Structure 1
Amino acid sequence: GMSNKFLGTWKLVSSENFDDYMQALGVGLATRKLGNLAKPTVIISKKGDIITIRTESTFKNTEISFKLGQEFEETTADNRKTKSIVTLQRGSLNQVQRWDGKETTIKRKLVNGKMVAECKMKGVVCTRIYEKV
């Protein structure tokens, strides 16, 4: 199952190409300016076989709870209503979001004790690095 090393609280320390990624999602300018300044905390928790990823920041809070391999309805930070799914691949915690015929991926993997989120949309790639805190 998900590695227990994911469990805990994570703080963003680096974000690369997040603006171009938000644009690819269709997020407008005012929202992107605040999104580019956000340094969110991400809390990953587990109750039985339901995993919860909770994102907290001054600008926006989000939370998804899910079971691996089971589609679920998601409301994203930019208020997209998506059909999403989280699965594992070589220990990486990979999320797909589908809506209005579009599709974006958020792959969260542990690299030397840090959590690295790789976000992809229409060939645009964003990388966000978190420290465990």
Structure 2
Amino acid sequence: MRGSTRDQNGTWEMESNENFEGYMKALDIDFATRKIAVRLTQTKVIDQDGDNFKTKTTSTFRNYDVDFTVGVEFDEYTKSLDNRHVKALVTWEGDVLVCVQKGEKENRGWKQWIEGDKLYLELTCGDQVCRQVFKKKLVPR
């Protein structure tokens, strides 16, 4: 993948989500939670100023907020997901935002990037990859 810009500001609505089940299973998220969440449309709100990100992922079941500064390791406590601690580091690789979440689970992280007018997110854990695509709702520019 390749990002067309580093500016990820805006509100984005999920248009596809593939193998979210596999990803959730790899995180040991319980059956009942998986069944509720698997096909609920998510919305992502990204507030970005340079390297400083504030993000919200919302649905009619659960939300998940994570804020970070690119380059700076932080303690991500994954409440409402698997309730673990990971040492999260988000970096740019070209115009792809790459997160590695170091902790118990192997190969845990995500990659997020813009192509033209859509936002793409790939979530990984263990041997599972989930691919998501979000259409634009709002951008500042």
Q: TM-score, length-normalised on structure 2?
A: 0.84
Aligned residues: 131
Residue 61 in structure 1 maps to residue 92 in structure 2:
no
Quote the sequence identity (%): 34
Partner of 1:3 in structure 2? Answer: 6
Q: Counterpart of 2:129 in structure 1: which amino acid?
A: V
Where do residues 92-107 of structure 1 align in structure 2 (5 Å cutoff)?
Answer: 92-100=96-104, 102-107=106-111
Q: CA deviation at 1:47?
A: 4.3
Q: CA deviation at 1:82?
A: 1.7
CA distance in 1, matches of 2:104, 2:32: 23
CA distance in 1, matches of 2:124, 2:88: 14
Q: Which runs of 4+ in 1 moved over 6 A?
A: none
Q: Counterpart of 1:106 in structure 2: which amino acid?
A: W
More helix by share: 1
5+ long unaligned stretches in structure 1: none
Q: CA deviation at 1:98?
A: 1.9
CA distance in 1, matches of 2:31, 2:133: 23
Q: CA deviation at 1:24?
A: 0.8
- 1:59-107 Cα offsets, whole Å, 9 max, x none, are 1112111111100111224123221111100100111112225441210
CA distance in 2, matches of 1:108, 1:46: 13
Partner of 1:126 in structure 2? Answer: 130
Partner of 2:87 in structure 1? Answer: 83
- Whether the 8 Å CA contact 2:107–2:127 is kept in 1: the answer is no
Q: Secondary structure of the residue that 1:70 maps to in structure 2?
A: coil
Partner of 1:115 in structure 2? Answer: 119
- The RMSD of aligned alpha carbons is 1.7
Q: Secondary structure of the residue that 1:38 maps to in structure 2?
A: coil
Residue 50 in structure 1 maps to residue 52 in structure 2:
yes
CA distance in 1, matches of 2:113, 2:120: 5
Q: TM-score, length-normalised on structure 1?
A: 0.88
